[PDB]
Design an enzyme around this catalytic site. Sequence first.
Site, PDB file in Angstrom:
ATOM      1  CD  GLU A   1      -2.225   2.347  -3.569  1.00 29.48           C
ATOM      2  OE1 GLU A   1      -1.789   2.442  -2.391  1.00 29.48           O
ATOM      3  OE2 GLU A   1      -3.367   2.759  -3.891  1.00 29.48           O
TER       4      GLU A   1
ATOM      5  CG  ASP B   1      -1.785   1.172   1.361  1.00 28.11           C
ATOM      6  OD1 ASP B   1      -2.828   1.175   0.652  1.00 28.11           O
ATOM      7  OD2 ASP B   1      -1.468   2.097   2.161  1.00 28.11           O
TER       8      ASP B   1
END
Length: 536
Positions: free
Chosen positions: A268, A199
């Site tokens: 990401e 993330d």
Amino acid sequence: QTPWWRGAVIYQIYPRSFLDSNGDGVGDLPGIIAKLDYISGLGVDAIWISPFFKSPMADFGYDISDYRAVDPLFGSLADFDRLLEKAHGLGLKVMIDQVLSHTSIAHAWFQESRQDRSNPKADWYVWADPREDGTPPNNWLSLFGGVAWQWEPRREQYYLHNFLVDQPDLNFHNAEVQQATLDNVRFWLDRGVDGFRLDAINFCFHDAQLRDNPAKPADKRVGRGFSADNPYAYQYHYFNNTQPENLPFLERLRGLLDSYPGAVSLGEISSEDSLATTAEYTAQGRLHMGYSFELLVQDYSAAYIRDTVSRLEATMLEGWPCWAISNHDVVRAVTRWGGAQATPAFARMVVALLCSLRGSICLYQGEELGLSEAEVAFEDLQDPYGITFWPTFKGRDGCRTPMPWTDAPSAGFTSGKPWLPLAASHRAAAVSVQQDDAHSVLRAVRAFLAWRKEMPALREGSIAFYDTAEPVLMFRREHAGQVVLLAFNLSADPAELALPAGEWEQIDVPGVELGAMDGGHLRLAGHAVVAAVGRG
């Protein structure tokens, strides 16, 4: 041989909304365990589970309060271990989210850090004195609204949060933070997980000088996970993220992953130049792959897809691409690209289009059903991002409504009241419904994936685009002497173009509408696909 993840199709589960197994209206780990047979039957190569760790759920799991624990809302660590075993038995690889850049305010580390300036973890978060007039130290704004700095009266200092106030950023310039982060990743590797979706991986480091970001004029503003009208869009994000110091840290992360052969990293990545950052972050010895928001936004045309994929291919040499068209942060691609009345033909076409690009693939839960974006009423809103920007940006609840297993009022998702209401559109297209109609989106997606399993040029091959006029996207995939021409009609209207040079033979591509090629011309109906092999 070539790694399992090279060209793999990864099924993203959003656990809150996949299957509720105890009636509280919220999906849980035992519900995933119960549907592992369905997921394996889709023909995908792996699952990626969004956060299920201990969390106050302010950002629905991306605010983590214990990196090594399962939140009781989802089950237990024993539940996760059983999920791993079962998935591996069906031949699935399991990836989990890792949220390394920030924690929940409820995390023990932040509870300690915030108490004063002198405690052992005082430097573990990004603390800064007020300016001389009491204001935040610089001009950084939160992506999710307001300034990026929150006052802490116990320290007479501000702490940084790129995301929610409840998500304080960790200070990765601190060596103990880097080590503790690696040790948490090692904990999950020691349970046997096959990899990690990382993330906001380019947010790990901020500029320690706290320099103001430069202003960005209105005609240059481009949203990626935020609207061009979000105040965050008014700055070039040079200093609040994507700092040079992240590169040796990625090299530490990769070294750790190298100790567990087969473990993969998927970052990401969203920055001022997301493709350039992806290339840098996937250079040799860093992350294995990255995905960005470039195919997650409004832009939808043959020119745009061709230019985007071509620019990444030219920019990224040593990394392996990963593409996605839907996830838990954006409007479902069926609606976002196909419109309010997107046909099932379009859903099947866009999934095949995605899986025919070069790279690994992220497939969001429900794309195999062709689901449309839900309409979430104001009183049902859950996502703080949407609450803050209502009504001009409605947040992310529209892609987080529950999976439709059956066409009952509760859709088989829950025996109680779902935490977000089911779209009515969805129970008419439930799994139990599409599982019978042999012309459904689901059966077509399974057929395409099983067909793709036998085409090495689609899984590992290179890619090269033809300069086609709208609305046809045409390119070649090539592997091991095999060459495969693919032509997609992105519009709902019929189209025609001249087949390109060479000797080509049509092969049927399951799951999608079939266009026709005759002599030297291709003619495709709306959302039709021609797939040919190069015999010559």
